[PDB]
């Protein structure tokens, strides 16, 4: 209880932690706090004391902090509210990195959420470097989107997606992703094309699987089991063979499951004989 100093304050330093909450309000010029933001995280203020520092920053920058101040927020980012962050114009990848790094392992809060929304809206795209930075901190990020959003990310951005990121994608997401990978990759030749496109084939059509078979590509069993079903179904026993290359023997091992049972059943039992392998099922005489 009061409203003046006795001594004021002109440096933001270890002395401040001994102030009472109002003394801080009385003695710290907000414009000074802003100007020495790069050293607040070194001073072990108490969290209630941080509240009064945050408030001061609001006074000074009432329509949103400048990136001059955001950069050095450090752990103060934990005290922002999404309305706070919605006023910002963060445009350096590095600043973003800095802010993500503070809640690194946590379930994306509304704060980092709005932060990320602000950042992308304000580049117009997910470009690529942006997507790199994001899957570095939130791996399931691309598949955390929703086919509406995914239709907007430009094929340029696809080079930043690593296959293990597609693990949590469901087929309606791959439906919009695969045509994007197709564009991102036409400059590739053959064995190089396949190694890139592989993860995206869960949304490919038969027209495109067929064309792959006619290449040398030596598709692994794991990726074949992720193929469509509707796309594998019209594949001739000859085509599936040339596709799986030296991995054909998997078929008997996945005789029961996924798109293979379905693919067996639609085949002339006198064709499955050509495979060695000894596949049971499918249509006789």
């Amino acid at each position: 209880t009061a409203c003046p100093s006795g001594k004021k304050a002109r440096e933001i330093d270890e002395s401040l932690i001994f102030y009472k909450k109002w003394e801080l309000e009385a003695c710290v010029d907000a414009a000074l706090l802003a100007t020495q933001m790069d050293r607040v995280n070194a001073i072990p203020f108490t969290y209630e004391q941080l509240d009064v520092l945050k408030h001061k920053l609001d006074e000074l920058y009432p329509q949103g902090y400048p990136e001059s101040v955001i950069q050095h927020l450090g752990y103060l980012f934990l005290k922002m509210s999404p309305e706070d962050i919605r006023k910002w114009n963060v445009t350096s990848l590095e600043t973003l990195k800095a802010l993500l790094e503070v809640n690194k392992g946590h379930e994306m809060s509304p704060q980092v959420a709005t932060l990320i929304d602000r950042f992308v809206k304000g580049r117009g795209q997910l470009d690529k470097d942006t997507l790199d930075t994001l899957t570095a901190f939130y791996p399931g990020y691309l598949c955390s989107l929703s086919p509406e959003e995914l239709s907007s990310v430009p094929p340029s951005s696809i080079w930043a997606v690593r296959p293990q990121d597609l693990d949590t994608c469901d087929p309606r997401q791959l439906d919009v992703l695969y045509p994007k990978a197709r564009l991102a990759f036409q400059n590739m030749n053959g064995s190089e094309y396949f190694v890139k496109i592989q993860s995206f084939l869960g949304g490919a059509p038969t027209e495109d699987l067929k064309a792959l078979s006619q290449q040398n590509v030596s598709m692994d069993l794991a990726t074949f089991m992720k193929l469509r079903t509707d796309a594998v179904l019209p594949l001739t026993v000859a085509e599936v063979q040339k596709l799986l290359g030296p991995h054909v023997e998997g078929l008997k091992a996945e005789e029961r499951h996924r798109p293979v049972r379905d693919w067996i059943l639609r085949q002339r039992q006198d064709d499955l004989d050509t495979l060695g392998l000894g596949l049971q099922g499918g249509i006789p005489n």
Partner: nanobody
Framework: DVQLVESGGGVVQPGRSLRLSCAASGFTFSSYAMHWVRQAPGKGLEWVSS????????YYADSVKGRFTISRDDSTNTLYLQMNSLRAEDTATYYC????????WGQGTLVTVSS
């Protein structure tokens, strides 16, 4: 003033139960996640449990999974840690903290001045 005060342990047959509690004061309890941190006398301190500010997210160390369960009563500024299936290594000093970093440290190094 802040201040948050624990209570509870003393006397424990290996396999019984025990409930600890933390009385919180001086800060908006709701808006800080809460953590139980463990100091086994003679070794360093290890984080054991944490609960988000909105009681939505619990976390437990493997040494304790299945045996401990945290709760948080937002109505009355108190934190709880329920300890079923108490083993022997559980014997230690139990701290309740709101610290934003908990376990942001190595095993420390021991500095001893004077022989």
């Amino acid at each position: 003033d802040v201040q948050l005060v624990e209570s509870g342990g003393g006397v424990v047959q290996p396999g019984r139960s025990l409930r600890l509690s933390c009385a919180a004061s001086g800060f908006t309890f709701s808006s800080y996640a809460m953590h139980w941190v463990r100091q086994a006398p003679g070794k360093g301190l290890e984080w054991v449990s944490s609960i988000s500010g909105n009681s939505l997210y619990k976390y437990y160390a493997d040494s304790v999974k299945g045996r401990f369960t945290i709760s948080r009563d937002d109505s009355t500024n108190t934190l709880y840690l329920q300890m079923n299936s108490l083993r022997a290594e559980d014997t230690a000093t139990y701290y309740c903290t709101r610290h934003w970093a908990v376990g942001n440290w190595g095993q420390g190094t021991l500095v001893t001045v004077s022989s």
